[model samples]
Target: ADLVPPPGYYAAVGESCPAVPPPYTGSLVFTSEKTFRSQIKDITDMERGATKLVTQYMRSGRDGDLACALNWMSAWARAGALQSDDFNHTGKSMRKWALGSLSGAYMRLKFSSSRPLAAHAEQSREIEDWFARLGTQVVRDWSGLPLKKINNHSYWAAWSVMSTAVVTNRRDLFDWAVSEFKVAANQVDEQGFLPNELKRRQRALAYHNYALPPLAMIAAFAQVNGVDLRQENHGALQRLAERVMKGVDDEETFEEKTGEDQDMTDLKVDNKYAWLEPYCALYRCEPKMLEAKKDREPFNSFRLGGEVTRVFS
Candidate 1:
């Protein structure tokens, strides 16, 4: 409630919303604290809450809360649609959250496609338009950039584009997703290090973990659509995952190259990434992989489409 912006306030990305209207504004004051943080949390929580409610509706087929939540979300989408473009934030305004949020909604709707809800059709259209707008923005922003320059961002961009393809039946976008995945796949050296991500220095391993989910997710999306990116680059993605899994437990190997001890406490097996669930579902190579994924059970990655167990199950 405290995070609510004033009337006519627009959600900003990476910074706070403008204090005054756009025309009168002087310059962008990048806000890294409450403004940006709360903006992310607000949308994230909205998506999380909506996913839970939608899952409940799918599981039981009787829930007014889901119906009400969908209605409210759809209403907000309409409002957001009317919102003017926010040029302050970087890398497409709210692109990450918007794509992830819409993907969750799209998946949940399809999960219960047979059992239509009251607002499903209308809300789906709204979500689709929102997705298309953000997707086009992402493509426009990064389409010409070198894959090596924007490794993780490209992975997410592909995920959003491919997801939009799935929801809108756009074959071209789907093919584009495959192309991007191939670019990402070939970037990994024989040492299992993505040269682009290794530039993070001390956070190399953590970035590797961050990079894995989208690659795995893009592969998962491809597999669903009769394409298999996991097989691309001669199985480089699988090799990368295995190498990173090893790095999570033994940071020394990566530190040798990075020249700095990795800061990867959050990536320990005890704090597994939810994306591992679907990843493991696809490539169950080792028992430790499954054990790590199980450790992060019930923690669904919004961008990877939804609750890992539920989607994979």
Candidate 2:
């Protein structure tokens, strides 16, 4: 086996999406609360509920909810949030909720604790161990997810890993992240679209939306690292983003929900907090797409992260 180092967290180098929306979204906390609430209600599908709770926690940073958030995650992990082996083994969903929500959340929490990323890397020993414990279960029964069996999934996994690595400046994780991205680039067409994703879901509107999170973050990271995702990937994502804006806005328009079910607590969906709204802010990408959509407040119950909560919206 060869040993390669992870990239360092050069904050200045990897800020691709920071000023993307420019001067920030002008909304105050009081306005986006309802949108945030709906998202929390929606994420429980396969351990993704943790993401909703995390969105909640980021908004309030309440001590009480932080405990709840941790509890929710522990329960999922212990209970097979990643689809451990139990009943069947045909195939399962292809998303990495644990890596995305739990590991991501842990990095944010550790970052907030004022611990250096390296200290957190030391802390991640426990996280890595936990993942190892679940590996057999994951490989055997719950291996339907993209990351488990394919190259594109590996790219997404690399994104999650790289993200944490950036925070911790972990050399190994950094190398892994870069490697995964290479996998993503090769697997997807020059158009920057992950055609493999189509194998799982046919809704272009829904599919493209999932791709944006990592794409956006990757672009942002590239800015900080003196690398250009657009260049490496052939400017495919920019076009893909344009298409998503059109689809989300025109193809999937829905009347904004109101009345009793208006908060994060009463809803159920992913990215409900309008975290991706930053995409709009940055690209000036889709005014019509998100026009009917609304933002919700950060939940005080499950701590997501301060950035998702505090970024001007």
Candidate 3:
């Protein structure tokens, strides 16, 4: 598979059921951090597959396609996938990304379709229980690490639990995520730098991009739940947002502070700036920023909830 599985498998153009790969319940992002070789391509592949299926279902509203997505998701759930993780927490990253992506797919299907998702009762129930299980693991992992550091990973966990809570209706999960958001909100210092993200030296700007999306998405999801966290910490999140957008235009600010030239390769590879969708939706983005979005339009990521541009629009 190039970057993702083929449409023939997920879009039901040829094969209706894309065979679900085994539970890739292992840390798979890197085999050696120095060489940057991967331990397993399996985890990323599964996410790409999920993202494709969910995007197609959202775009077409085809129950057949939705059913295909559910089948694969449920099979993984039934296998007790992602029950454990590796030392790198890459496995947990996959878990959280799945939490966000699967939640988005479920929300759109259940909220939009007149046909009750309960009609796919068994599959829906399995998926929900699995999410709740993953969320419990999320709480356990982040709660421990929060004492050590509350950085971008914490913000991602916040988004994951927040995304999971809607599907399971777990207020404790939702509230936990919001509290994490509050911590990150306060961490956004004046001039919009997330202190921890800036420590990456060469990749400070890239980490900021990674960090900002979770906050933007958390704020939007919270607003849907009647909380206005975008206004929290006197809009410190926006300060981070402003700095990030500027850093993209001219890396000089970060290059000076970090004492190293920026590395923007990952930002170019995937739409790392997908957060602009929700941020602009909530804040009315600047013209230059909006124009920049013309290139990244259809901002999509399984990690940020699939079909981000469409969902936020």
Candidate 4:
């Protein structure tokens, strides 16, 4: 029992979500706190496994892969996993992040024409309803967060509701997410460092990278819906992207600001550059960034809806 994967982590089509769901909790640890670090590892692994399956299906169009992936998702929806957090803002953020993350995978499934959909359409509705439920909860949770500090968290939340609104065709949720995008665009000050992401000290650079993907995704999703979020705040997202890529190439930029060498804790190179895929679609991508991505296709990131390069391509 202890060795089995989480409810949402499915390895095969035969695997399934548990009948008795787990009350999932989110983590906020950012360091070598061995205990907490291990706890957080489980969450990342859980999400990663499920999204990896979705990406595999996206690439192969294999009904078997889609079946396994849907089984994992359907189980979660039935369990109502991530539907609520007992307290902690971290848990709430997890719910929203999952909403945006999982929805991206589900979006690929729903929008495509395939046998998987033909077979799973009945189950997909339950999953979509769960997404709407979690998204609505995300909006409520974020409403109380201090708007002044509107940081990566808000951007992530906006992404959560934005995708949920798209799937459910809810204008209220869509408008709220777009309004949040405006606030985030304005927050990308002249320096391009999001004021809030810069406060993570040593991990400030990492946080900037982390903060970027959601906005990149929000812009992409908005564009598809016939809204041009790219032009907001004088292309503030591109400015932020410039500063971020520069920092990734030469850490001195963030070192001068955050006063600490960048932390490498969760900064995997594959995931670090995942945002470039979506961002490049809207703006003139840096030659260096393009070169970097050329070597790493299908840059999978759970938050940006796994297999970004493959799905976006």
Each candidate: what lDDT?
A: 0.63, 0.42, 0.73, 0.73
**lDDT for position 182 in model 1:** 90
lDDT string, candidate 3, 53-81, tens digits: 86776667667787888888888789887
Pairs with steric clashes in candidate 4: none
Candidate 1, residues 255-311, lDDT tens digits: the string is 998999998665764324766755775685587888876656766565555555665
Candidate maximizing lDDT: 3
Model 2: C-alpha RMSD to truth?
A: 12.8
Number of colliding residue pairs in model 1: 0
Considering summed lDDT, which 10 consecutive residues are worst modelled in model 4?
A: 1-10
Off by over 4 Å in 1: 1-32, 39-42, 80-93, 117-119, 268-272
* Candidate 2 displacement at residue 78 in angstroms: 9.8
Q: What C-alpha lDDT, on a 0 to 100 scale, does residue 200 get in candidate 1?
A: 90
What's the TM for model 3?
A: 0.86
- Number of clashes in model 2? 38
Cα TM-score per model: 0.80, 0.52, 0.86, 0.83
